[PDB]
Design a protein around this ligand. Structure first.
Ligand SMILES: Nc1nc2c(ncn2[C@@H]2O[C@H](COP(=O)(O)OP(=O)(O)CP(=O)(O)O)[C@@H](O)[C@H]2O)c(=O)[nH]1
Ligand SMILES: [Mg+2]
Length: 167
């Protein structure tokens, strides 16, 4: 059975846990409970292949920033999440990407840029600007909503395809 080690990263509050819980449990968490580190092992069929997804839901709190090298070494693909209503979270993306590239000593690590909270009207990050950043990295970009489930399956399945396409 093919196993994929997915790691969800991004700033504190972007919706990493809500995205993961929506993918796995099909419901939206309204409450904000800061994550330390949670892991899920889930079986899914993607493109006719039975996949075992090992999903690591990480801490966005900068206080847990020394925990990152370990999961960056074991992780095969990274869901780099920002929120479309949080400009700082979009600027933090580059720091996450650089750190991943350094830990794995590679310019070609499977990644997907995710612009979450697309259900909200308070956008501060233009879709075109996010698309241009993803293009500069050579990675896919998808907008998602952990609330409506828009783009959620596509974001995780695209990351699996990036790990598989890189393999
Ligand atoms: N409207 C809307 N709210 C969202 C969405 N995703 C998450 N949220 C909300 O944002 C807040 C933080 O979500 P959460 O999933 O805990 O973010 P996180 O990135 O895991 C926080 P931490 O880094 O500390 O673990 C919660 O109030 C949650 O309901 C979304 O797509 N749309
Ligand atoms: Mg969380």
């Amino acid at each position: 059975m093919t196993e994929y080690k997915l790691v969800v990263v991004g700033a504190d509050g972007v919706g990493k846990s809500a995205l993961t819980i929506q993918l796995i449990q099909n419901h939206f968490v309204d409450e904000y409970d800061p994550t330390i580190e949670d892991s899920y092992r889930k079986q899914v069929v993607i493109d006719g292949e039975t996949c075992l997804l090992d999903i690591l839901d990480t801490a966005g709190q900068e206080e847990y920033s020394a925990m990152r090298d370990q999961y960056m070494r074991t992780g095969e693909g990274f869901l780099c999440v920002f929120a479309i209503n949080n400009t700082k979270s979009f600027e933090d993306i580059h720091h996450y990407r650089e750190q991943i590239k350094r830990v794995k000593d590679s310019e070609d690590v499977p990644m997907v840029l995710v612009g979450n909270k697309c259900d909200l009207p308070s956008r501060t990050v233009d879709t075109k600007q996010a698309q241009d950043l993803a293009r500069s990295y050579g990675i896919p970009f998808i907008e998602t909503s952990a609330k409506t489930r828009q783009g959620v399956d596509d974001a995780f399945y695209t990351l699996v395809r990036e790990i598989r396409k890189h393999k």
